[PDB]
Structures are given as structure tokens and as C-alpha cells.
Amino acid sequence: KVFGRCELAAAMKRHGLDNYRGYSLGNWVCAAKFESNFNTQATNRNTDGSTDYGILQINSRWWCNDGRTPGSRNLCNIPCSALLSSDITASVNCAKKIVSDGNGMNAWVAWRNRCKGTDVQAWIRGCRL
Ligand SMILES: OC[C@H]1O[C@@](CO)(O[C@H]2O[C@H](CO)[C@@H](O)[C@H](O)[C@H]2O)[C@@H](O)[C@@H]1O
Ligand SMILES: [Cl-]
Numbered sequence: 001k002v003f004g005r006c007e008l009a010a011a012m013k014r015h016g017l018d019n020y021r022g023y024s025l026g027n028w029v030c031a032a033k034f035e036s037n038f039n040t041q042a043t044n045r046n047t048d049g050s051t052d053y054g055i056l057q058i059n060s061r062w063w064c065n066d067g068r069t070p071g072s073r074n075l076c077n078i079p080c081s082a083l084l085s086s087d088i089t090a091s092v093n094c095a096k097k098i099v100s101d102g103n104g105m106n107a108w109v110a111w112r113n114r115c116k117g118t119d120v121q122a123w124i125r126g127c128r129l
């Protein structure tokens with residue numbers, strides 16, 4: 001599915017992402033916008049043979065297992081196919097591990113380049129929450 005901006009903000013808040021490990025809700029909504037354009041089925045292949053899956057473009061070399069990526073670590077212990085669900089539970093649970101294991105939200109290239117440093121509060125402005 002394709003989430004609306006405030007629709008995804010509400011769902012991400014219900015799943016505990018607001019201020020998680022120091023990142024306000026707008027960071028996560030902005031991340032999803034530029035990672036997947038709010039599409040839960042987005043997938044993209046990378047130069048290292050890995051693939052990014054889903055609303056938060058979770059990677060098959062480190063985080064989820066897609067059975068075709070050498071050196072797979074599967075640190076989220078989840079098949080990548082589960083991350084293409086319209087329900088964001090598995091993606092959020094894995095994202096909490098990613099942002100806890102390394103350098104914050106910098107793992108997400110699109111967030112790093114196109115969200116970090118801007119006023120991310122604008123991404124939840126006007127939403128019901
Ligand atoms: O995720 C660990 C590590 O991998 C890098 C390498 O570019 O990012 C990959 O994983 C991200 C999270 O799933 C993806 O969003 C990204 O597209 C993918 O390249 C590093 O940024 C990150 O620290
Ligand atoms: Cl915010």
C-alpha cells in the first residue's frame with residue numbers, strides 16, 4: 001500500500017517510534033518518504049548484491065534474510081518478504097534494531113542525505129496526533 005503522510009505518522013506513533021532512541025516522529029516519516037515514497041512494497045537492488053525492502057528499505061546483507069545475499073547477517077531475524085506487508089509491524093521492529101545497532105538513523109541513506117539537518121517536525125505538522 002501507499003501511506004498518506006499523516007496516516008503513516010499515526011501508525012508509526014502507535015508502534016512506538018516517536019522519540020525512539022532520540023529520533024522524533026518527523027524523522028521516521030521523512031525517512032519513509034525518501035526511502036520508499038511511502039510504498040510498503042518498494043524494493044531496490046544495491047551494488048553489493050543486497051536488496052532493500054519495504055517502507056523503510058531494510059537491507060538484506062545486514063538486517064533481513066532474502067536468501068540471495070552473500071554474507072547475510074539477518075540481525076533482525078526476519079525474512080525480507082515479511083517486510084513487504086502493508087502492515088508496518090515487522091519493518092518497525094527491525095528499524096528499532098537498526099537504529100540501536102550502529103550510528104542512529106545514519107544507516108538510512110535517503111534520510112541521511114535528504115532529511116537530516118532539516119526541520120523534520122514539518123512531516124507531522126497538521127496530523128491528528
Ligand atoms: O544498514 C547497515 C549499513 O548499510 C548501509 C550501506 O549503504 O546502508 C544499507 O542499509 C540501509 C538500512 O537497511 C539501507 O537503507 C541502505 O539503502 C543500504 O545501503 C549503511 O548506510 C548502513 O550503515
Ligand atoms: Cl518531529
Ligand SMILES: [Cl-]
Nearest residue numbers: 033034037114
Ligand atoms: Cl521529492
Ligand SMILES: [Cl-]
Nearest residue numbers: 119121122123
Ligand atoms: Cl516547512
